[PDB]
Amino acid sequence: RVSSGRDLNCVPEIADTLGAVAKQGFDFLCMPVFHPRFKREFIQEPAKNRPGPQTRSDLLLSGRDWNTLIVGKLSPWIRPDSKVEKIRRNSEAAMLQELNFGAYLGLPAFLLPLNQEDNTNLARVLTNHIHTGHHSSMFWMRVPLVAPEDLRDDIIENAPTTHTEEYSGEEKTWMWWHNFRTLCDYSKRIAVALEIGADLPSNHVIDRWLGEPIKAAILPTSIFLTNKKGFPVLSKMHQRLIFRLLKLEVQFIITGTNHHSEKEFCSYLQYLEYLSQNRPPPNAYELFAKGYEDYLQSPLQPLMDNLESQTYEVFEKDPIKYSQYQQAIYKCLLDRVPEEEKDTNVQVLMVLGAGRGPLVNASLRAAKQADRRIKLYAVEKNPNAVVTLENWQFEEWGSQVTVVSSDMREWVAPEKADIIVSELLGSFADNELSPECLDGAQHFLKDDGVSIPGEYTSFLAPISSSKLYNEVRACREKDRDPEAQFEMPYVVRLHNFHQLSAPQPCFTFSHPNRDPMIDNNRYCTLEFPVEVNTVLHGFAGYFETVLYQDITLSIRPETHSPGMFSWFPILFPIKQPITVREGQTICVRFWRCSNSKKVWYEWAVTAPVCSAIHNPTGRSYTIGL
Amino acid sequence: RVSSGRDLNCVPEIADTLGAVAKQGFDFLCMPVFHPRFKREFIQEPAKNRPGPQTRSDLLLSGRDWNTLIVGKLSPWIRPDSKVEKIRRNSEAAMLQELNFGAYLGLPAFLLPLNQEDNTNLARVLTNHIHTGHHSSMFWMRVPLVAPEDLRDDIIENAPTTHTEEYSGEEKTWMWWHNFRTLCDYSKRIAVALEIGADLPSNHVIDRWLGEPIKAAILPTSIFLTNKKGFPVLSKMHQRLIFRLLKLEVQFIITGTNHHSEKEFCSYLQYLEYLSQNRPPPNAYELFAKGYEDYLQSPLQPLMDNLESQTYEVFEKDPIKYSQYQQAIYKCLLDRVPEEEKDTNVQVLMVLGAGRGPLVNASLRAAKQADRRIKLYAVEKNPNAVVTLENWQFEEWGSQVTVVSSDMREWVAPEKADIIVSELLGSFADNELSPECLDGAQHFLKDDGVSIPGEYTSFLAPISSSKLYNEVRACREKDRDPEAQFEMPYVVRLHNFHQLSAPQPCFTFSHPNRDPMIDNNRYCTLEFPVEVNTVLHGFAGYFETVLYQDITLSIRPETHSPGMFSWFPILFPIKQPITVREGQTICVRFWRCSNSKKVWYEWAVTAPVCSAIHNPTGRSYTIGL
Amino acid sequence: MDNLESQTYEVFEKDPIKYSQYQQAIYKCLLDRVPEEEKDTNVQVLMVLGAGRGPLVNASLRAAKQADRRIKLYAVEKNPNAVVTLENWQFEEWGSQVTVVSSDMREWVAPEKADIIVSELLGSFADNELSPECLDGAQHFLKDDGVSIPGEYTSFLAPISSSKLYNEVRACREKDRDPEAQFEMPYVVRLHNFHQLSAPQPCFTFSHPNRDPMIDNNRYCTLEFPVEVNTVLHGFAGYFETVLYQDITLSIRPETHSPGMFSWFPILFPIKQPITVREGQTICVRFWRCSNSKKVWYEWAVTAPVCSAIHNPTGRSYTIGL
Amino acid sequence: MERQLEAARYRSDGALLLGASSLSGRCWAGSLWLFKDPCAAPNEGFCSAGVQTEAGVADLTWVGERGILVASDSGAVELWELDENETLIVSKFCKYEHDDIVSTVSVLSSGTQAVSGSKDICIKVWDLAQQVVLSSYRAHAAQVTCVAASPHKDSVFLSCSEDNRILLWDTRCPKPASQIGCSAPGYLPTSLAWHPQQSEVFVFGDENGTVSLVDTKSTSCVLSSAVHSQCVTGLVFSPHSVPFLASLSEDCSLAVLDSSLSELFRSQAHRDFVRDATWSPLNHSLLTTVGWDHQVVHHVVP
Numbered sequence A, B: 001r002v003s004s005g006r007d008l009n010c011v012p013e014i015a016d017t018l019g020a021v022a023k024q025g026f027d028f029l030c031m032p033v034f035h036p037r038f039k040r041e042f043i044q045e046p047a048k049n050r051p052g053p054q055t056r057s058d059l060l061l062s063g064r065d066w067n068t069l070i071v072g073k074l075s076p077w078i079r080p081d082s083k084v085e086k087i088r089r090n091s092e093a094a095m096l097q098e099l100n101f102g103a104y105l106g107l108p109a110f111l112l113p114l115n116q117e118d119n120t121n122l123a124r125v126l127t128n129h130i131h132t133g134h135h136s137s138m139f140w141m142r143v144p145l146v147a148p149e150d151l152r153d154d155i156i157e158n159a160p161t162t163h164t165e166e167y168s169g170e171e172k173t174w175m176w177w178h179n180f181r182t183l184c185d186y187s188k189r190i191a192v193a194l195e196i197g198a199d200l201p202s203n204h205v206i207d208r209w210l211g212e213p214i215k216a217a218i219l220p221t222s223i224f225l226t227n228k229k230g231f232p233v234l235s236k237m238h239q240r241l242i243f244r245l246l247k248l249e250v251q252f253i254i255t256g257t258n259h260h261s262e263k264e265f266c267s268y269l270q271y272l273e274y275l276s277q278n279r280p281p282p283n284a285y286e287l288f289a290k291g292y293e294d295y296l297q298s299p300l301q302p303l304m305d306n307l308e309s310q311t312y313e314v315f316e317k318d319p320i321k322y323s324q325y326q327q328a329i330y331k332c333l334l335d336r337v338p339e340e341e342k343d344t345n346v347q348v349l350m351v352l353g354a355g356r357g358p359l360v361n362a363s364l365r366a367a368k369q370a371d372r373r374i375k376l377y378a379v380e381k382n383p384n385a386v387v388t389l390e391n392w393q394f395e396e397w398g399s400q401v402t403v404v405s406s407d408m409r410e411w412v413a414p415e416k417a418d419i420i421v422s423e424l425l426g427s428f429a430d431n432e433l434s435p436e437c438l439d440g441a442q443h444f445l446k447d448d449g450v451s452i453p454g455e456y457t458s459f460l461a462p463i464s465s466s467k468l469y470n471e472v473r474a475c476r477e478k479d480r481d482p483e484a485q486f487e488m489p490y491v492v493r494l495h496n497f498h499q500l501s502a503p504q505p506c507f508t509f510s511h512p513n514r515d516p517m518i519d520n521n522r523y524c525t526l527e528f529p530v531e532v533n534t535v536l537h538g539f540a541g542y543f544e545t546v547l548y549q550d551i552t553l554s555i556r557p558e559t560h561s562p563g564m565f566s567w568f569p570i571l572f573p574i575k576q577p578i579t580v581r582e583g584q585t586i587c588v589r590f591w592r593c594s595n596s597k598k599v600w601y602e603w604a605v606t607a608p609v610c611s612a613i614h615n616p617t618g619r620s621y622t623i624g625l
Numbered sequence C: 001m002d003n004l005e006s007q008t009y010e011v012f013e014k015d016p017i018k019y020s021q022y023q024q025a026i027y028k029c030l031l032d033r034v035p036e037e038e039k040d041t042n043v044q045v046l047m048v049l050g051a052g053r054g055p056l057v058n059a060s061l062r063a064a065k066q067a068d069r070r071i072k073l074y075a076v077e078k079n080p081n082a083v084v085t086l087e088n089w090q091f092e093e094w095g096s097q098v099t100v101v102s103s104d105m106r107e108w109v110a111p112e113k114a115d116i117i118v119s120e121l122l123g124s125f126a127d128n129e130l131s132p133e134c135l136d137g138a139q140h141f142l143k144d145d146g147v148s149i150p151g152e153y154t155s156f157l158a159p160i161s162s163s164k165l166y167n168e169v170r171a172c173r174e175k176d177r178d179p180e181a182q183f184e185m186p187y188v189v190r191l192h193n194f195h196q197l198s199a200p201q202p203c204f205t206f207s208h209p210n211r212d213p214m215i216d217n218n219r220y221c222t223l224e225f226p227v228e229v230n231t232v233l234h235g236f237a238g239y240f241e242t243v244l245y246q247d248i249t250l251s252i253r254p255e256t257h258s259p260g261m262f263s264w265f266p267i268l269f270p271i272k273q274p275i276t277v278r279e280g281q282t283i284c285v286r287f288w289r290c291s292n293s294k295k296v297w298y299e300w301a302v303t304a305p306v307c308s309a310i311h312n313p314t315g316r317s318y319t320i321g322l
Numbered sequence D: 001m002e003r004q005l006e007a008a009r010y011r012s013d014g015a016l017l018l019g020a021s022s023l024s025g026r027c028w029a030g031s032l033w034l035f036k037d038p039c040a041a042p043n044e045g046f047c048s049a050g051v052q053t054e055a056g057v058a059d060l061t062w063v064g065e066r067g068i069l070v071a072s073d074s075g076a077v078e079l080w081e082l083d084e085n086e087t088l089i090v091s092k093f094c095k096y097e098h099d100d101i102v103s104t105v106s107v108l109s110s111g112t113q114a115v116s117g118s119k120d121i122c123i124k125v126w127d128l129a130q131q132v133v134l135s136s137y138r139a140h141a142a143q144v145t146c147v148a149a150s151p152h153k154d155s156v157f158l159s160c161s162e163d164n165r166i167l168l169w170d171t172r173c174p175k176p177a178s179q180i181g182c183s184a185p186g187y188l189p190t191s192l193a194w195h196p197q198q199s200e201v202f203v204f205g206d207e208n209g210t211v212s213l214v215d216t217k218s219t220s221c222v223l224s225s226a227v228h229s230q231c232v233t234g235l236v237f238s239p240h241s242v243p244f245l246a247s248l249s250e251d252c253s254l255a256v257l258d259s260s261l262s263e264l265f266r267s268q269a270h271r272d273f274v275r276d277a278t279w280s281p282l283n284h285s286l287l288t289t290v291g292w293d294h295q296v297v298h299h300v301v302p
Ligand SMILES: C[C@H]1CC[C@H](c2ccc3scnc3c2)N(C(=O)C(=O)Nc2cnc(N)c(C3CC3)c2)C1
Pocket: A297, A298, A299, A300, A302, A311, A314, A315, A423, A424, A425, A426, A427, A432, A491, A565, A566, A567, A568, A569
């Protein structure tokens, strides 16, 4: 169910209040650590020397309670960006005081508001406070989805609300955060508490908060409608937004008093719980990848490294994929051996990169299903998996399967193959050097032989995610280029991100490649129309592959093979985020480069602004041959 | 109870065997991943091309079982340091094969033996294997507590056992490990599995393994005696060793067949469980510090930083300490106010550094117990704790206590004090600048006033701990001096270490310091007699303090105040370990330095070899004033 | 791994003693392979593997002209920038007598097999520039009774003390890498302010042709150096000797150094931590030559009187590309 | 059966005893087989008797005519008797007294006692009647590689271990073992064989492939030859009055030598390790070798 919280600006007795909100069902409480109206002076006497105490004692709750249940709130009278110098300095001091007291309490989070365009001095004070202490705090920035100025009732006769299309103005609130977030140098301890009003804005304004680090969504009791019985409920669009937020796994904060006086205060929260429990229950893919969401992993290199047993175990626990492989082999067998030759013709079938032998069992099932004879070779360079292959062969397969423990580029086969079958594809299709391996294996393929897969194509799409950008930035390591983490890809279940344009094909490879002047290097120029305002942080990469005829696999979201969980998308980041205004085209360039020993990718943005060429000479990322 | 394991060199069927050892009560199993007698060839044909499989399949157990329950064993025929070149190369290849298969299985540990002085090529291969893969393995080095050559029966007529005192020879086995450990550059993934024989050596040989990363202790069934009933038991010295190992929280591995055929195989293990459960159950101190053992923490600086609420909460949950403070104040009150003046004389008593007011309550109890009047000041610079102090004062204390929220060096007091009371002491006595603060506070102390504490003295002792040295080494961080972690102290509950000499006093401070030419800098030269062979890695630091007359506190182990858990010892490391032979004296130098803004320590070893001067100009560690 | 610049070759060529020795070796080999009666009926095939700008080619021409024998020359060189110089030489002066081949000697599919192959792929540590691997790859176009010049080479190691060179190596620390990587790599240096702590002893030796079936160029060598002084070990100096043909040899080993030969400086393998050595003790060092498909590197460690760390494991700080 | 043939021994009447282990695959067990037709070996279907054991077998030997002594991977010594007119192989006893793999066993001159060597570095003397261990000696410092009883005295036997020690024993001495090393730092001994006639002389093989002949009372290496390229695993003398010496190695070759250790016959017939060898009592010119390639080869020796 939902992890919820209760916002209050009135706490007469902290123990009673916390107990009450616990009885109501909430998981945590947002409250002021000083009294909201208790303005304090720091510079000018006499109020400077006000006799204490200045707030409650920390003994009123246990340290566990402070650590887990209490979220601090900056007093609303603190204005660090006031036009008045006096108020400016005094609010600097007061904000430092309240932040340091929240840190002294060990609170898990502290709330500060963004109510205007200029929060520069506020950001200065907060960045200082972050960079001083030894604490482990988190800071939630309260940002309205619609600024109060743009949400007011048109009841001012001489200052009416402009009913004119203002595309960029309706997004002003985001810009607020974006400037603040930028001034604090993309701090990982600064997130968003997105407040939601009664009138929801255009869909692009709501999309402007995709990829942003939203930890909390704030719901006032005002935005709740009433049904026949008297329960508080939400409109259809508010419900859509609530589901979208539930997928981001945010915490929900209820604010405001109870206006449905007949019902209890747990009714607002019960409605959220009812929305949560009555959502489409999780399917197998989402169940498996729920914990992997936005988790950066370095790509595997099964050619350079020998994969561990459980990596293969992950690869094998995927029925849809091997069903497709079996179907492709079945069709190919039928298309190569006529019915009258079924016993006089036995096909030679080599699995190149066999692992622990799922493709071998799939080939056996395909032949048994198509009523044709096959002779199997199981080529695998990883000797640890060759152990598994040979135990399989001795115990179950028999002499029908010939296990070969060598590199397919090296192996001098006795006979040529009718069908070669591989799954050397990475998240970016060719990023694990399937083309080079199958090129080296092409010489023991018959003059009319088939390769499964026969085709594969990589796809790129510009994305925006200030969350994944911050993760990549956090991947900085000692003893290397301080920006090397931006010049390498990552296999990740992209989650909190925004697709800025439709994916387009990048690189394509065919097999067999009969071409005389074989060259697997590439140079591709892609232009992505962007019809939104956004900030580019990287490029998501998917792939499609034709195994045989119309049997295909795909991780491209539009054509994704349903319920296939062997590949996650890849992510190519960029050092500097790139602002993109609505209507502009994002032009990116991608190279596939190689020498005798290494293969790597280089990439660069050329429009609307130019980026640096990333990973030149494979300095930060290579793929070993 | 004990976390135990079972060692076997015979596994006919892995599933049956694992189930049996689970029924016997063991928690994990050590077994060969290839057959022990199944020697393999890699260079010379024809045995080179031996048809597979080469061992069992990884499907026989679940990945969870491989990850948790199985410990690999290097086949005993693999000799990487053979005098024969052929065997050398072949064993290199075979050891790489077995290590890589263990990594492919994801085993939590892998056993390799140290049976001789020269394991150089073995260390080369193991270090390579460590530095190649992406794995997360651990390597247990099987080292005998007594070499088999020195444990043989004197039954060779022409080669008798030399019955002559061989102090360094009896330690040869340790040197083995020490060389191997050194060749692999103190790798954190290389630990010790200490094997124990029937005859235990001299006590200094057993002490040679203090401070070493012992993860496992191996017990053969041979070393077990038999009692009246027929159970297997251990001798008194073996039991002492078992208790010593139990405090190091090692895992116990049973090896060898069952020679007590009347009893079950769980009898050997039951005896270990009986030794464990019938040991002195944990007292309060060890209960609290059990999880803190060998945990490096940077020292607190309550002057430079404002301590959090729960740090003070830790400080306050310590009854013995405040009992001693109350007793000291009680005696001082009685010694300053005669019985006839009890009502005509009210003492002025200032707590300098009051925190959340435990010393204030202790002073109140002291006055109420001694039947004397006191006027209390509670001086505290941390305003967050001044909040707690003022809530206390309003609710409970009353106008008897005057809370002062300022620095004791700055505060211009209205009247001078009879008694000043502080607890500004760190683990190294003066390492939190108690002397400077009390110096700045001396001007509002009466001409005949008392300071509690009146004296404090720091103590140093050379220690050996290749474990804590490796932790300190692991504390390397980006954006600073790559060796800065060795030039700073750490507050730690020292556990796996060896005291190489008796602690001796370092620096001493008195209060009040009436001296005209006040100077808190220090230069101290200490000579520590070392009557063992060892490797210096750092210096443990403790302190003693005289609060009043004979009321004292101490973390010096010989004079430690019983059951006082406010301070852990401090540790000053050194960049390079320093070999120390028996009889040599370790001569160390320690400086206390300061300017207007910073205070720091410098230290250096001058004998038997010279070290670098550590933390010069406070470059790696300063204490702010 | 890299194509040497023009002036590096210019340094290599301004060394008369060395090419005099090469010419003498070729001269003797020519006389020993072609009898006087066959001088006109027998023309020897002679391939310079790693020809540079062609000093060995001119030396071979002088050797044949001096020994009164016929030779057919191939000039194999992978560096195309120096192949430019070679081909200008061939067009202007050499003529069709020399056939310039611009490829790798491991790759090149020669038309005929060679009587004599001649190389100078030696580094300061003999094999530290992968002369063995290149000549192994070139052995297949050598005749069944062919000669390789040089035929033998041996590296030499000697423990030294120099708190000056240790401090220089320490100063070689760079951002964006292992803070101690500078100690786990060798340096070519004219050692000057240093002290030899023991006599140099042979480390690794290679022969050519290596007819052996189970060819393996990796090595493991254990050296014990008697030290009869008190000192502080900081590293190991490395020299080499090489037999070009019979008794014609080159050497940078100080005791047997070829007089007035300035093509090689000694090499230096440092160690992270200096090691005190008292009089009478023996310094025991271990040296490995390691390789895979792509890289070749050295590992080394001191085992006596105290143990050091194994330096450059898995070639993490220093590799030599194949 | 199992793939790795470990032991092959001829009985007095000419029957062939075979001991095998499985050193790879799911099960690491062992087996004992008796072939009254020695040319039908290894084939399991054409055997006279057979039995499966708990664990693999490392060494084997006859106890006279009906008994078979087994050193097990389990750390046990097993005695198996031939029963039911030699159609069964039933376990007489199986005692677990070693703490590691038992690598070698040898029956003494009497035939009622035996001696075992294990990887626990211990050597043990067994009474085959009482089924108990008489004496347990820890003489070596590394795993015992071979033990070989003297042919005619059951108080005397040789033992070699990987601590580079070759011990001549005499259980009648209070310090029974005696170190009798050739030269000084010789390579590790691996196989031991007494000479059939000439007593007080024997031969031992090392891990380098060298076979050496040594006299006890003279205690000086009178002769030695580099016969094999790899370690020498076994040495068997022929029943001839002038005995031939069969040498087995891990280079997968069999060699036959005279009294001066010169190469007379050589067999590359095995494509894996050569593990055992025995001469036929019926025909003294026929030699039977078994290997890890599951081959049972019969050589004719000129
Ligand atoms: C599903 C997730 C877990 C497994 C895997 C992954 C990625 C990175 C790391 S780093 C440590 N472990 C991992 C594991 N992953 C992938 O998307 C992926 O790489 N799939 C893939 C690669 N190469 C292939 N030839 C294939 C063919 C089907 C066989 C599939 C994400």
